[PDB]
């Protein structure tokens, strides 16, 4: 058996089943596995990427690929206009969050 390379934040876990079926989620992970740079980088986040999944409605997923361990961190998932533009203080906190989390997991 192999340990999973995918790691869900509490927020993502809270929201995943709403936006994706298990089958769709499996395919999304498989796409990420093959192409970890699948999404586009969100500026000033230290490499967080943003990807839209077509699926109802389309979903956006935010993730970070930790290159060192080849492991994926799934931040959050949302529909159109449920998230907002970040400012400096928020990018600061978000990067610290990624870090802290990365170090607990």
């Amino acid at each position: 058996h192999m340990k999973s390379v995918f790691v869900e934040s509490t927020i993502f876990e809270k929201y995943r089943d709403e936006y994706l079926s298990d089958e769709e989620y499996r395919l999304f992970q498989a796409e990420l596995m093959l192409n970890p740079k699948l999404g586009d980088v969100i500026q000033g986040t230290g490499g967080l990427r943003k990807i839209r999944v077509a699926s109802r409605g389309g979903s956006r997923i935010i993730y970070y690929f930790l290159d060192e361990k080849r492991r994926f961190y799934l931040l959050t998932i949302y529909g159109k206009n449920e998230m907002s533009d970040l400012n400096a203080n928020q990018r600061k906190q978000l990067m610290a969050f990624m870090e802290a989390w990365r170090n607990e997991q």
Epitope: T10, I11, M83, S84, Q90, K92, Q93, A96, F97
Partner: nanobody, 121 residues
């Protein structure tokens, strides 16, 4: 199953106090920002307060500023809202969210059933 558990509500006289609790269930809230919004019947959701994971950053809505104090205890997995000088305008059900930063990034959404706060004579 992850959720936030709100408690500490109740009825109080004008000028009175209450302390509200937001306790994570099914996860650890240490690294997350937490915020409060409230909803009264016939009113839209209105943001109340928010706090960063380290506690070094707090936010308050204008109409509660000065009166409310938000704090957290990470070892206890709980966030608090100290409400002082309560006004009838503060009557509402209070709800807790978890997020990546303070100020909040995501639009308000329910993490629990909330706690009722009534201030009246």
């Amino acid at each position: 199953q992850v959720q936030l558990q709100e408690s500490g509500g109740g009825l109080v006289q004008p000028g009175g106090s209450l302390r509200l609790s937001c306790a994570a269930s099914g996860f650890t809230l240490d690294y997350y920002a937490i915020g409060w919004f409230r909803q009264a019947p016939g009113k839209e959701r209105e943001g109340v307060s928010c706090i960063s994971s380290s506690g070094g950053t707090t936010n308050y809505a204008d109409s509660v500023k000065g009166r409310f104090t938000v704090s957290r205890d990470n070892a206890k997995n709980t966030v608090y809202l100290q409400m002082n000088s309560l006004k009838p305008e503060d009557t509402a059900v209070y709800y807790c969210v978890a997020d990546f930063a303070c100020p909040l990034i995501r639009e308000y959404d329910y993490w629990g059933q909330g706690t009722q706060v009534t201030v009246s004579s």
